Amino acid sequence: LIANQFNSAIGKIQDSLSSTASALGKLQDVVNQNAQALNTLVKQLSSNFGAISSVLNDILSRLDPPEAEVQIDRLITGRLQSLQTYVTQQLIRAAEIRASANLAATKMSECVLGQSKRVDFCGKGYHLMSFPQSAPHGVVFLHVTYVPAQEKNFTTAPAICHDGKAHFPREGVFVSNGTHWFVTQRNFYEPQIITTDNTFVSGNCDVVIGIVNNTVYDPLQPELDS
């Protein structure tokens, strides 16, 4: 069931990428933003900046240096300011990319290279493993996550008294389906009968609030009885 459910989940990954292009928005936004930045840079090249004419060869040809120097200085100041704006925009965007790159590097090391017990750092749900896929000027992650599906009602109690001694679970929870008492693992319903091997004894009944009365079975006892 896991094998087929995972293969189907990969299948849905296939269909979701093949059909829906909204996923690649962030990388497409990076590429479009950068290309639009360069295009804006060239547009600023072909803009007059408050001179007689935008073309340097034009202003050169028509006016000689003694008067022309002010116009050329204006074109220099305009272009240099436009280049300043463009570089500062690119440099800051490079910094945000670097932050995303480092976040990816950490996510690569801590999630792909090893399983990570951090919650929602690797997609919603408990994390199992993640896979890298290359992409133009970016990386695409598949996050294989475990998600609990169907609930079931049980009555519960913090601890169990057997002979006046209170028993707590080493791992899991005391759950009763109404007429009998079982211990189950926390993230999946795998009921097991209460034994001394799953529970450790401590103290007495009176201190713990909400405790219920429940027989605790000892696996050793039928072995010594037999």
Partner 1 sequence: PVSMTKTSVDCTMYICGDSTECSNLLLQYGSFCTQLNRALTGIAVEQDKNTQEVFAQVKQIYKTPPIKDFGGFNFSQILPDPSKPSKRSFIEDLLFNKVTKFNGLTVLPPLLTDEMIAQYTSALLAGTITSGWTFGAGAALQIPFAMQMAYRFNGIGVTQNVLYENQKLIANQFNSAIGKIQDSLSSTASALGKLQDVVNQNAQALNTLVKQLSSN
Partner 2 sequence: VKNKCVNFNFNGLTGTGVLTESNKKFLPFQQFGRDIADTTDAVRDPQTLEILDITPCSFGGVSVITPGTNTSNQVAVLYQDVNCTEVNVFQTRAGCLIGAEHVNNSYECDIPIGAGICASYQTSQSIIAYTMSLGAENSVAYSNNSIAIPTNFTISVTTEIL
Q: Quick check: helix, strand or coil at residue 33? A: helix
Number of amino acids touching a second copy (CB under 8 A): 13
Q: Of these, 7, 20, 134, 226, which contacts partner 1 (CB under 8 A)?
A: 134
Q: Is the four-CA dihedral 58, 63, 66, 67 of positive or negative sign?
A: negative
Out of partner 1, partner 2, a second copy, none, which partner does residue 99 contact, by CB within 5 to 8 A per kind? a second copy
Distance from first CA to last CA of the chain, Å, rounded? 40
Cβ–Cβ < 8 Å for 186, 149: no
109-168 binders of ligand NAG (CB under 6 A): 151-153, 161
Q: Tell me which long-range contacts 10-14 makes (C-beta under 8 A, separation of at least 24).
A: 10/142, 13/142
Which x/- pattern, by CB under 8 A, does the window 32-71 give for a second copy? ----------------------------------------
Cβ-based neighbour number of residue 225 at 10 Å:
6
Task: Please give the Cα distance from 34 to 93 (Å, whole number).
Answer: 9
**Cβ closer to partner 2: 3 or 42?**
3
What distance in Å separates the CA atoms of residue 18 and residue 20, rounded to the nearest whole number?
6
- Binding of residue 64 to ligand NAG (CB under 6 A): no
Q: Which of 146, 198, 195, 139 is nearest to 6 (CA)?
A: 146
Min dist. Cβ of residue 156 to partner 2 (A): 4
User: What does the binding site for ligand NAG look like in residue numbers (CB under 6 A)?
Assistant: 151-153, 161, 205, 212-213
User: What does the binding site for partner 1 look like in residue numbers (CB under 8 A)?
Assistant: 40, 43-44, 47-50, 78, 82, 85, 89, 97-98, 100-102, 104-105, 108-109, 112-115, 117, 119-120, 124-129, 131-140, 142, 144, 147-149, 151, 156, 158-159, 166, 168-169, 173, 186, 200, 202-203, 207-211
